[PDB]
Amino acid sequence: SDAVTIRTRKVISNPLLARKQFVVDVLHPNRANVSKDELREKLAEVYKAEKDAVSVFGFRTQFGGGKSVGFGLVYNSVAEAKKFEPTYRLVRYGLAEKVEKASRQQRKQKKNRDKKIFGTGKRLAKKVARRNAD
Template sequence: MADSETPVTLRTRKFIRNPLLGRKQMVVDILHPGRPNISKEQLREKISGMYKAQKDQVSVFGLRTQLRPCLRLPEAMKKFEPQYRLVRVGLATKPERASRQQRKQRKNRQKTLRGTAKVKGAKAKKEK
């Protein structure tokens, strides 16, 4: 059986009639085991068939997929995963840096020196 022939199940939840916007809106759970994600065009066709509407009346938006655990080799993880996820699983170490307050204080000290001759930093303010 090819991927495009496997069945797709649509379950409607939270059906609301919204007369202010002139539409009916719903949350649709899409079940497609053993098959990749379905295109929005195919979803529009299936939903229009379910609700006896024309395809151009259906708008599909806000698709989210459920998270599933994935298995990946450590080399691929180091190449593709963001740094914070590598720290979580123990493949990288968190970089040591000063506390947030110390970094802000250093930034503000540097702001007083900007545009002046950086001799000692004591003459930061101009005298009138």
């Protein structure tokens, strides 16, 4: 509305991870509180790698309303990014899969329900079959 003006600072390209590390300054007059990923899709065009090798977290809204501090991370690789992207940022972006194991209180008791087994336990399971009801 009033030139959101993606401007970039501290543009440091890492050669040993095939990426760039940089701090985004965002001054956005007359319209605030945009998005995670619209600014990436405007940043991923000016850096010419792809659309979705960029990893943002930020848009720390500065006081007043109209200025923010972002922090994106474009990589210089597409599929090799997912080998080293943080997986919580990937499930924020939806390209990867969200894991779903049990919660805390079901898993650690399952460790307690793991030591009581003798071996693979089916020697007991044959014996608790025969006896009961004997």
